[PDB]
Each structure stands twice: as structure tokens, then as C-alpha cells.
Design a protein around this ligand. Structure first.
Ligand SMILES: Cc1cn([C@H]2C[C@H](O)[C@@H](COP(=O)(O)O)O2)c(=O)[nH]c1=O
Ligand SMILES: [Mg+2]
Ligand SMILES: [Mg+2]
Ligand code: NA
Length: 433
């Protein structure tokens, strides 16, 4: 009814958004002015017994598999709680690195648990945003008034913890990262008000499409992590064409690159810009001469490449584990309707549910869903199928490797008492599972 922001963040058991499992979700809702209006939403996800967490992830988060299992609900119920927060009308769902990471975790949790992986983002006036590329855009285009820390390599850092410390934001508990993300939003809104407004409005794919002039190859500023911190994640780009299959993807040339292989053949300075993924795009003059110089971006090289590309328009023409299979395709309307019945049927009425799916992923999705979330509902043949599944995960190579990694880390981090205790926990859990 009113426009709100839902700030959120996952802690996970590893960095693969499909093949690792979530540990904890944290979120809070604000009004359109970033005033907190909701209660903190913090909860855990019970990991199924076909999985061991990445030791490195647990050393970072401090959340053991024992803790998520004892404090969590099954992933079906975890997914339900997240889906009910995300689908409140007129919600902008945002975080810090959510476009690349947390949103991929969400898509995969929804996929595995019979929710639509995509609808949450856009239905009922919803949107997404991400403060990471907002911070990157400020550094590159409007750095005044913010402290920009360097990492140990002498490159600008966009780690949330570095930006908060550098700008006097308290950081810190479970909610610390979510509150830090709200503080970043307020920082940019205060210190770069017009840029903040511009970036917020341009989260919308139609505002982004208005910038794109393919016939003219109209140059734009693009701020992207792919460009690299050494050039402030920034270049001038030109649109060449739209993707043959992906409706949301435009094919850009990086004008700072070497266009020789693109001109001559039948590094390639070509990238996809996904207009549904909050890319930072603006008119060319948004990168001011002083900032182009600061970032080492060569205007004349970019313009020379642009001139060549415009004179050569032939360039436009030139350019298994079911858990890993989200992007194998969109489901049919019938299959989506069938999966909605799975979702909305009681888990006790699921064994008796006779329903047809055509997409070949759904049989395996359904078996995993029932065995992971509702193991008490499995019959004997299903129990034996699950035992085989666990065996095929816990291969001789995998189990040896896991033990080896723990034994290496406990020696490596011998003097870190908190890490030693976490490694003990990881061994204990692996021994059980
Ligand atoms: C920063 C970092 C995160 N992670 C995992 C655990 C975190 O819950 C998850 C998200 O962390 P982040 O949002 O700080 O990037 O990624 C690692 O496995 N290794 C790492 O070095
Ligand atoms: Mg995070
Ligand atoms: Mg954290
Ligand atoms: Na956290």
C-alpha cells in the first residue's frame, strides 16, 4: 500500500548460490525514507543430511551446521517466511551484493521449494536494488564527501565492513549487516542526493531502455564490478545489439578495450548488460573529465573506437544435479500450475498426490523436496533412494578431502581459538553425517 524497502542479507554455508545451503536470513522493513517500520526478521535454515558446509564459510560466519540445524526450520518453511516478506506489495527488495549473490540464493531456494523463482521481484509494483553498485558508482562518478578505503593491495575496497569503518558507521549481532546496509543508503542519499535519486529511479528497466540507442551506438557510462577496481569499475560503453535469446540482455562494447579481434575475427571487449539486474548506466558526460583522469580512462581511445564501430556496422551481426539446473529453462504454464499444487498441498497429502509434470527436472525436484524437508513421509523404497543419493554425494574422494581440509585448517589457524573451536564443531558434524 505504501512504498517500502526490505533490506536483507543471507549467511550461507558456502559461496555457490545453488550448491551450497543457506544458514541464516536477516531482514528489516523501512519506509520510503529509510525509517525502520518493521521488526527484525532473523531465522535459520536446517541443512538436509546430504550436505556438509564449506569449512571456510563457517570460519567467516561463525554459524555452525549444529546451530542452523537446532535453531532452524526446514528449507520449505525458510522459503515460506522469505517469500511472505518479499511478496508484500510495493516492496523494493535490496541488500549489499544481492544482485550477484543473495538474489541467486533466493532464486535457488524458491526453485528447490516449489515457489516461482522470479515473480517476487516484479509482481505487485515490487523492485530490486543493490547498494554495492551504488557505492561503486559514487566512487567512480561522485566521490565527494565519502571516505574511500583502500584494501591491502592498494585498490579501492567496496567490502561493506571497510566502507562502514571508513565512514564512522557502527558495524556492529545477527542484524549488523542489514543495519550497515541501511546506513550506506542514508550515507549516499545525504552526501550525493541527485546521484542517489538517479540510481534509484534507474533501477527500473524502462528507464534503462530509454538510455540505449543501438542505431546511433550512443555511448554511455557503465559502472560494473567486471571492469575492475583498478579503473574504479567504470568505462564508456556502446550498445551494438540485443541478445538473440535473452529478452533482458543488451550487447555492449567496452570502448576502452581493444576492438581489433572484434573487427578482424569471424581479449574480446564485449559484455552483456542485463536491464533487469539494476546495472549502473548513465549518459556519457556523467563521467566528468577530472574523474576520467583519476580513473585512468582514456576519452580519445574510447572516441576513436566508437568512430571505427559506427563506420563498421557489420560488427552487430557478429555478436546431473537437479540443484544446478535452475537456468536449464523456464517452466511451462501447466508445469508452474502443477508445482503450485505441490506447494499448496499439505506435506502429509503429498505421497497420495497424483499430478503430471512434463519438465524432466520436476520428478527429481519433488523427490529431493520431500526427502530433505519431510523424511518422515518417505516409504521404504524412497528411504533407499535417499540412502543412495547420500552415498553419491559422500564419495571416497569427497570425504577424504573434507577431513584433509579440516586437519589443514586446524594447523593453519592453531593460534586462533575461535576458529579452532569452529573447526572442532565442523569435525563433530561431519563425523555424525
Ligand atoms: C566474504 C566471504 C563470504 N563467504 C560466504 C559466507 C557468507 O555468509 C556469504 C555472504 O558473505 P558476504 O555477503 O559478506 O559477501 O558468503 C565465504 O564463504 N567466504 C568469504 O570469504
Ligand atoms: Mg551478504
Ligand atoms: Mg556477515
Ligand atoms: Na550477518
Amino acid at each position: 500500500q505504501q512504498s517500502t524497502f526490505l533490506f536483507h542479507d543471507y549467511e550461507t554455508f558456502g559461496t555457490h548460490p545453488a550448491l551450497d545451503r543457506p544458514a541464516q536470513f536477516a531482514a528489516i522493513r523501512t519506509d520510503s525514507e529509510f525509517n525502520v517500520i518493521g521488526e527484525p526478521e532473523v531465522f535459520y535454515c536446517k541443512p538436509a543430511d546430504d550436505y556438509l558446509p564449506q569449512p571456510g564459510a563457517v570460519l567467516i560466519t561463525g554459524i555452525t551446521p549444529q546451530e542452523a540445524r537446532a535453531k532452524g526450520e526446514n528449507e520449505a518453511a525458510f522459503a515460506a517466511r522469505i517469500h511472505s516478506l518479499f511478496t508484500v506489495p510495493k516492496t523494493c527488495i535490496l541488500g549489499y551484493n544481492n544482485v550477484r549473490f543473495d538474489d541467486e540464493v533466493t532464486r535457488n531456494i524458491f526453485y528447490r521449494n516449489f515457489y516461482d523463482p522470479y515473480a517476487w521481484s516484479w509482481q505487485h509494483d515490487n523492485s530490486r536494488w543493490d547498494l554495492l553498485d551504488v557505492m561503486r558508482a559514487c566512487y567512480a562518478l561522485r566521490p565527494e564527501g565519502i571516505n574511500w578505503p583502500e584494501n591491502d593491495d592498494g585498490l579501492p575496497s567496496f567490502r561493506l565492513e571497510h566502507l562502514t569503518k571508513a565512514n564512522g558507521i557502527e558495524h556492529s549481532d545477527a542484524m549488523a549487516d542489514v543495519y550497515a546496509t541501511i546506513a550506506m543508503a542514508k550515507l549516499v542519499k545525504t552526501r550525493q542526493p541527485r546521484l542517489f535519486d538517479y540510481l534509484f529511479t534507474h533501477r527500473n528497466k524502462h528507464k534503462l531502455m530509454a538510455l540505449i540507442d543501438v542505431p546511433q551506438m550512443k555511448p554511455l557510462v557503465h559502472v560494473s564490478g567486471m571492469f575492475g577496481a583498478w579503473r574504479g569499475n567504470t568505462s564508456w560503453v556502446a550498445p551494438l545489439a540485443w541478445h538473440p535469446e535473452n529478452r533482458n540482455a543488451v550487447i555492449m562494447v567496452d570502448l576502452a578495450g581493444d576492438i581489433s579481434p572484434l573487427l578482424e575475427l569471424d581479449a574480446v571487449p564485449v559484455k552483456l548488460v542485463h536491464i533487469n539486474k539494476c546495472p549502473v548506466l548513465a549518459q556519457a558526460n556523467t563521467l566528468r573529465p577530472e574523474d576520467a583522469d583519476r580513473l585512468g580512462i582514456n576519452r580519445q581511445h574510447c572516441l576513436d573506437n566508437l568512430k571505427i564501430l559506427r563506420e563498421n556496422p557489420q560488427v552487430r551481426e557478429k555478436v546431473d544435479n537437479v540443484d544446478a539446473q535452475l537456468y536449464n529453462g523456464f517452466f511451462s504454464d501447466a508445469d508452474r500450475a502443477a508445482m503450485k499444487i505441490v506447494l499448496e498441498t499439505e506435506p502429509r497429502n503429498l505421497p497420495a498426490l497424483d499430478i503430471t509434470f512434463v519438465d524432466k527436472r520436476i520428478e527429481k525436484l519433488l523427490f529431493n523436496y520431500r526427502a530433505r524437508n519431510f523424511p518422515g513421509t518417505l516409504d521404504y523404497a524412497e528411504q533407499q533412494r535417499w540412502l543412495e543419493h547420500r552415498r553419491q554425494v559422500f564419495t571416497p574422494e569427497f570425504l577424504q578431502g573434507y577431513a584433509d581440509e579440516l586437519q589443514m585448517l586446524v594447523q593453519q589457524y592453531a593460534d586462533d581459538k575461535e576458529k579452532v573451536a569452529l573447526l572442532k564443531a565442523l569435525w563433530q558434524y561431519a563425523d555424525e553425517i
